[PDB]
Design an enzyme around this catalytic site. Structure first.
Site, PDB file in Angstrom:
ATOM      1  N   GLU A 149       0.877  -1.076   0.108  1.00  0.00           N
ATOM      2  CA  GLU A 149      -0.108   0.048   0.011  1.00  0.00           C
ATOM      3  C   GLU A 149       0.945   1.422  -0.016  1.00  0.00           C
ATOM      4  O   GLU A 149       1.606   1.554   1.125  1.00  0.00           O
ATOM      5  CB  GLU A 149      -0.895   0.061   1.291  1.00  0.00           C
ATOM      6  CG  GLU A 149      -1.867   1.243   1.027  1.00  0.00           C
ATOM      7  CD  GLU A 149      -2.801   1.253   2.389  1.00  0.00           C
ATOM      8  OE1 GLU A 149      -2.729   0.438   3.381  1.00  0.00           O
ATOM      9  OE2 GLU A 149      -3.674   2.106   2.402  1.00  0.00           O
ATOM     10  N   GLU A 155       3.293   9.720   6.500  1.00  0.00           N
ATOM     11  CA  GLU A 155       3.499   8.451   7.259  1.00  0.00           C
ATOM     12  C   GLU A 155       4.273   7.712   7.153  1.00  0.00           C
ATOM     13  O   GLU A 155       4.945   6.811   7.649  1.00  0.00           O
ATOM     14  CB  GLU A 155       2.125   7.614   6.884  1.00  0.00           C
ATOM     15  CG  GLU A 155       0.867   8.293   7.107  1.00  0.00           C
ATOM     16  CD  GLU A 155      -0.261   7.240   7.482  1.00  0.00           C
ATOM     17  OE1 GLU A 155       0.044   6.068   7.309  1.00  0.00           O
ATOM     18  OE2 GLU A 155      -1.396   7.641   7.565  1.00  0.00           O
ATOM     19  N   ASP A 182      -5.175   3.267  -2.250  1.00  0.00           N
ATOM     20  CA  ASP A 182      -5.926   4.165  -1.006  1.00  0.00           C
ATOM     21  C   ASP A 182      -6.193   5.492  -1.513  1.00  0.00           C
ATOM     22  O   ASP A 182      -5.378   6.222  -1.710  1.00  0.00           O
ATOM     23  CB  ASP A 182      -5.319   3.954   0.214  1.00  0.00           C
ATOM     24  CG  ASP A 182      -6.115   4.455   1.387  1.00  0.00           C
ATOM     25  OD1 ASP A 182      -6.449   5.759   1.220  1.00  0.00           O
ATOM     26  OD2 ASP A 182      -6.267   4.079   2.346  1.00  0.00           O
ATOM     27  N   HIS A 185      -4.862   8.598   0.384  1.00  0.00           N
ATOM     28  CA  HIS A 185      -3.452   8.491   0.203  1.00  0.00           C
ATOM     29  C   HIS A 185      -3.006   9.167  -1.087  1.00  0.00           C
ATOM     30  O   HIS A 185      -2.332   9.766  -1.169  1.00  0.00           O
ATOM     31  CB  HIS A 185      -2.674   7.070   0.466  1.00  0.00           C
ATOM     32  CG  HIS A 185      -2.658   6.724   1.951  1.00  0.00           C
ATOM     33  ND1 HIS A 185      -2.084   7.708   3.001  1.00  0.00           N
ATOM     34  CD2 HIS A 185      -2.971   5.773   2.773  1.00  0.00           C
ATOM     35  CE1 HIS A 185      -2.267   6.933   4.150  1.00  0.00           C
ATOM     36  NE2 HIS A 185      -2.848   5.833   3.996  1.00  0.00           N
ATOM     37  N   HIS A 208      -8.647   0.534  -1.016  1.00  0.00           N
ATOM     38  CA  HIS A 208      -9.288   1.076   0.011  1.00  0.00           C
ATOM     39  C   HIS A 208      -9.846   2.551  -0.230  1.00  0.00           C
ATOM     40  O   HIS A 208      -9.133   3.197  -1.145  1.00  0.00           O
ATOM     41  CB  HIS A 208      -7.953   1.403   0.990  1.00  0.00           C
ATOM     42  CG  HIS A 208      -7.573   0.379   1.972  1.00  0.00           C
ATOM     43  ND1 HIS A 208      -6.583   0.396   2.633  1.00  0.00           N
ATOM     44  CD2 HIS A 208      -8.248  -0.852   2.284  1.00  0.00           C
ATOM     45  CE1 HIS A 208      -6.686  -0.662   3.540  1.00  0.00           C
ATOM     46  NE2 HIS A 208      -7.387  -1.597   3.102  1.00  0.00           N
ATOM     47  N   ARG A 214     -10.822  11.556   4.840  1.00  0.00           N
ATOM     48  CA  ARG A 214     -10.764  10.323   5.468  1.00  0.00           C
ATOM     49  C   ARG A 214     -11.957   9.921   6.252  1.00  0.00           C
ATOM     50  O   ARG A 214     -12.205   8.785   7.069  1.00  0.00           O
ATOM     51  CB  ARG A 214      -9.496   9.954   6.339  1.00  0.00           C
ATOM     52  CG  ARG A 214      -9.193   8.495   6.176  1.00  0.00           C
ATOM     53  CD  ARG A 214      -7.646   8.298   6.683  1.00  0.00           C
ATOM     54  NE  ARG A 214      -7.203   6.988   6.269  1.00  0.00           N
ATOM     55  CZ  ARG A 214      -6.085   6.355   6.714  1.00  0.00           C
ATOM     56  NH1 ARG A 214      -5.388   7.064   7.498  1.00  0.00           N
ATOM     57  NH2 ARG A 214      -5.971   5.165   6.245  1.00  0.00           N
ATOM     58  N   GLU A 243     -12.015   1.939   4.289  1.00  0.00           N
ATOM     59  CA  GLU A 243     -11.106   2.263   5.463  1.00  0.00           C
ATOM     60  C   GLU A 243     -11.202   3.833   5.686  1.00  0.00           C
ATOM     61  O   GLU A 243     -10.409   4.436   5.303  1.00  0.00           O
ATOM     62  CB  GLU A 243      -9.792   1.822   5.029  1.00  0.00           C
ATOM     63  CG  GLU A 243      -8.563   1.792   6.423  1.00  0.00           C
ATOM     64  CD  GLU A 243      -7.466   2.121   5.581  1.00  0.00           C
ATOM     65  OE1 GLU A 243      -6.474   0.954   6.353  1.00  0.00           O
ATOM     66  OE2 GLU A 243      -7.057   2.605   5.116  1.00  0.00           O
TER      67      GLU A 243
END
Ligand SMILES: [Mn+2]
Length: 269
Positions: A149, A155, A182, A185, A208, A214, A243
């Site tokens: 991912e 992060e 995702d 991201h 995701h 988010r 997610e």
């Protein structure tokens, strides 16, 4: 395409009953809302009774489609690229335990933060250490399938884009490793998300979704419509897994809003 829900679970060492209760609550929520599978994340599978988890999955007719591993890094400091080879070995051993659980469910094993960061090193060295750890994981497992991912710059500084991951997949050269994209991201790191997903193509194994903040898909400003047009164009027929933060309104409301947003996008393809 199928819809899955990621469910947050308390760590079983730091509360066994809470892990079981969170898991049942979340699986019952997923089933009630209409999701076809659930996705989980566990730090150390050694402390969970997975026979009981399998019974719950069978009772509710809800497969477990993917298992996240990032808590092995965030809580336990384990990294597949750690400068200390002893920790690298322990990280490989931990991820092997995730694959043992994944094999009971046919689940993908997610390689997120467990891959570790550059820690002041060259991208090249970090990448080489990672490729070596992934090759060891492939040598250690006969059936496990892994998804890398890409994560945003806050992060990690190692694998931020789909292209970063595609380059690594070409070096690993195994169909047992693919990409997990995702939308939260990608909203930061990708220039043109439809183009990025076209480059991924058949290597996109898992997906995701969460909005730009988010929150539940539908509750930010991310362009899911263009994404879903591209997923159809590339023939993506695996899981779209929610997610997201439990917002707005908590975990149940977020899961319901997310499902409604995604179902409308999918049905109109
Ligand atoms: Mn994700």
């Amino acid at each position: 395409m199928k819809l899955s829900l990621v469910i947050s679970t308390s760590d079983a060492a730091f509360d066994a009953l809470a892990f079981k209760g969170d898991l049942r609550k979340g699986m019952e929520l997923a089933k009630r809302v209409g999701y076809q599978a659930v996705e989980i994340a566990v730090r150390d599978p050694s402390i969970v009774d997975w026979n009981e988890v399998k019974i719950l999955s069978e009772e509710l007719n809800l497969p477990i489609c993917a298992i996240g591993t990032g808590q092995a890094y965030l809580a336990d400091g384990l990294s597949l690229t750690h400068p200390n080879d002893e920790i690298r070995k322990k990280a490989i051993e931990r991820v092997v335990k995730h694959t043992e659980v994944a094999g009971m469910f046919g689940a993908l094993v997610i390689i997120g933060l467990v891959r570790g960061r550059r820690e002041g090193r060259s991208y090249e060295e970090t990448e080489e250490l990672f490729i070596e750890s992934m090759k060891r994981l492939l040598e250690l497992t006969e059936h496990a399938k892994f998804v890398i991912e890409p994560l945003n710059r806050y992060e990690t500084d190692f694998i931020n884009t789909i292209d970063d991951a595609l380059r690594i997949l070409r070096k690993i050269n195994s169909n047992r490793v693919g990409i997990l994209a995702d939308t939260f991201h990608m909203n930061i790191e990708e220039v043109n998300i439809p183009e990025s997903l076209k480059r991924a193509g058949e290597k996109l194994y898992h997906f995701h979704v969460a909005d730009s903040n988010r929150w539940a898909p539908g509750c930010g400003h991310f362009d899911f419509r263009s994404v879903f047009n591209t997923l159809k164009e590339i023939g993506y027929n695996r899981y779209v897994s929610v997610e997201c933060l439990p917002l707005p309104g908590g975990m149940e409301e977020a899961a319901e809003i997310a499902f409604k947003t995604l179902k409308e996008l999918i049905i109109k393809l």
